[PDB]
Amino acid sequence: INVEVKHGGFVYYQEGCCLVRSKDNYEVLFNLEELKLDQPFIDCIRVAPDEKYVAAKIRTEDSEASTCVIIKLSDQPVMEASFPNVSSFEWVKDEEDEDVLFYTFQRNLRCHDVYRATFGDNKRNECFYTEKDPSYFVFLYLTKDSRFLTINIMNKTTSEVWLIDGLSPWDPPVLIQKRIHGVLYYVEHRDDELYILTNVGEPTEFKLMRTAADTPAIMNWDLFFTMKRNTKVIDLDMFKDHCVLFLKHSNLLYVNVIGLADDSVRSLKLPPWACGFIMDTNSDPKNCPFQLCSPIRPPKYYTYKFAEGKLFEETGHEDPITKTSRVLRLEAKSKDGKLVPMTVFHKTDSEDLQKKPLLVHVYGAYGMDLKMNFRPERRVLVDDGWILAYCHVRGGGELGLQWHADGRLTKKLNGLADLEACIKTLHGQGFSQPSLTTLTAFSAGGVLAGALCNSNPELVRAVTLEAPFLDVLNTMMDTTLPLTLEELEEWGNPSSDEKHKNYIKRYCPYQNIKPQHYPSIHITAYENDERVPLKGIVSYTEKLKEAIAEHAKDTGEGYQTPNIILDIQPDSHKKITAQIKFLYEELGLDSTSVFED
């Protein structure tokens, strides 16, 4: 998370709790200690275009709030100004060469606001934008050629964009298009012509719409390029001559190189193991660098040189796991006949007897997808002979908006059905038998893991949960604390409508704990959180033990009892180590899991 900003040809990074300017020799612009903060970590650095000032925002743990500190970038590394609670900021070079800082903070929870800080003649904080609606978030973005500073007013379903001239920082912002509910727009400039990324008209289809910078209304927009329906745009990298569009769909990645000054589109060939895209913020201006990664392979560097056909792998580092592990894309068939993508990872020199411990990962909530970034512990499990699988199930977002809508408020059980289908499908393919199956889930995904434990316990041997959202019904029916509308729409309100109360009762894993055989379950939980009360987990743990205890008393006759383990913490490696030891003990695998990280 270490912030790195390169400008003026010298990079600026935070080291030793002090703002540092690097050409092993560095110059300290500021000492973060003076701010009287504990463990202050720099989240954002923005360097004035003419290097007179540098601004950065500094945050500490256990604080929602952070402060933006402005240092003179002059030979004097002294403080110029500071401003608390700044969400974002950016610099614009005035026509008088005055580097003015635009920044966004919030006047209480009432509204957010954009101010322009002038230092050279002491004009300080002039207001350029004021907010009216607390549900929207104001964020600043300047494009690459600094033609237009953009004020982005955003929500998840809709956005509004206002432009501030990069050649006239004092002018009032100009609205491109008044907000339309359900429509989000992102704006980039090429040559007194704008390209707009938008889902106007059709919510499930993002498209490239072009228009003159002086003719911003929707009615004047033409069509430049369209993406496949329900694909996810992760990024759009604008250049003078072309743009590079980065897309994801399902479990496939695509890169589209689209000429703008030359209307011809080019698709790039990506390797089959890539499961996600890492974007660079080096903003190099005559190349489009990016990295590809997978949960079992550290990020690799690729660069597209708009100039030549292809010179992508400039990186000299490569990992043999590319050839020693295989990435299968195998969909499962649901109870209602739908296809549920699943990503499966296994060794290519694996034995004919494909009956090895299988780890299944599920989230299935809030429209989120499963993060595919590299995790050394997951790779080790594969090196030891583990088969990993990721289930892209209803309630998440990999296949479109309807995937979030389904497997949700009145239909959560569909996410459960998709998880069940995935597990049975893997067993059906023959990767593992139930005795070697392991399931893992986090926070919201714990609902699905819990519910599966109650409905089909014979499918899993051991389950590993982190701070799971288990007692859904009491958490949701807690009228004392108002339920956030966001959640209220991710879990029906049982306090206002009996059908939600009944639907939730039907899937809530706490409520449905019943005397029967269970998988061994290890729970990692924390002392202090807001989303997952510890008392919920403790009650679950106590009730779960009682159910299996009653089961064991009537039918056990010497049979072993599933190990129910609750580990409370106020370190990631310690957590991982404990989880691996738990699973290996349950799976009777022993331990040679030695690694460098």
Residue numbers in the entry: 111 to 133, 140 to 686, 694 to 720
Question: Which sentences did the original study use to describe this structure?
Answer:
Congenital myasthenic syndrome-22 (CMS22, OMIM 616224) is a rare genetic disorder caused by deleterious genetic variation in the prolyl endopeptidase-like (PREPL) gene. The PREPL protein consists of 2 structural domains: an amino-terminal 7-bladed β-propeller domain and a carboxy-terminal α/β-hydrolase fold catalytic domain connected by a hinge loop. The active site is comprised of the triad residues Ser559, Asp645, and His690. However, in contrast to its homologues PREP and OpdB, PREPL does not appear to possess protease activity despite the structural similarities.
To investigate the potential impact of the patient variants on PREPL conformation we solved the structure of p.Arg243Cys mutant using cryoelectron microscopy. This PREPL mutant was chosen due to its ability to be purified to higher concentrations compared with the other PREPL variants and its stable behavior on the cryo-EM grids. The resulting map was resolved at a resolution of 4.01 Å (using the FSC 0.143 criterion). Therefore, this structural study shows that the Arg243Cys variant did not affect the ternary structure of PREPL. Arg243 is positioned on PREPL in the loop connecting the β-11 and β-12 sheets of the third blade of the propeller and is not conserved across the homologous PREP, OpdB, and AAP. This residue resides in an exposed region on the protein surface, where neither the original arginine nor the cysteine undergoes any interactions with neighboring residues. Based on its location in the PREPL structure, it is not surprising that the variant retains catalytic activity but, instead, may affect protein-protein interactions mediated by the β-propeller. Moreover, we evaluated the cleavage of DIFMUO by CMS22 PREPL variants, where we saw that PREPL p.Arg243Cys (102.6 ± 26.2) had fully conserved catalytic activity, while PREPL p.Arg647Gln (43.8 ± 8.3) showed a 2-fold decrease in substrate cleavage activity compared with the WT (100.0 ± 23.6). We next assessed the folding and thermal stability of PREPL mutants by circular dichroism (CD) spectroscopy. p.Arg243Cys, p.Arg647Gln, and p.Ser559Ala PREPL share the same secondary structure as the WT protein. They all exhibited similar thermal stability, with the melting temperature (Tm) of PREPL WT and the p.Ser559Ala and p.Arg647Gln mutants calculated to be 63.5°C, while the melting temperature of p.Arg243Cys was 61.5°C. Their unfolding process displayed a 2-step pattern indicative of the presence of 2 domains as expected: the helical catalytic domain and the β-propeller comprised of β sheets. PREPL p.Arg243Cys had 7 decreased (NDUFV2, MRPL11, MRPS12, ARPC5L, DCTN5, DISC1, MDM1) and 1 increased interaction (UBL5); PREPL p.Ile412Arg had 8 decreased interactions (NDUFV2, MRPL11, MRPS12, STX5, ARPC5L, DCTN5, DISC1, MDM1); and PREPL p.Arg647Gln had 5 decreased (NDUFV2, MRPL11, STX5, ARPC5L, DCTN5) and 3 increased interactions (UBL5, ADM2, DISC1).
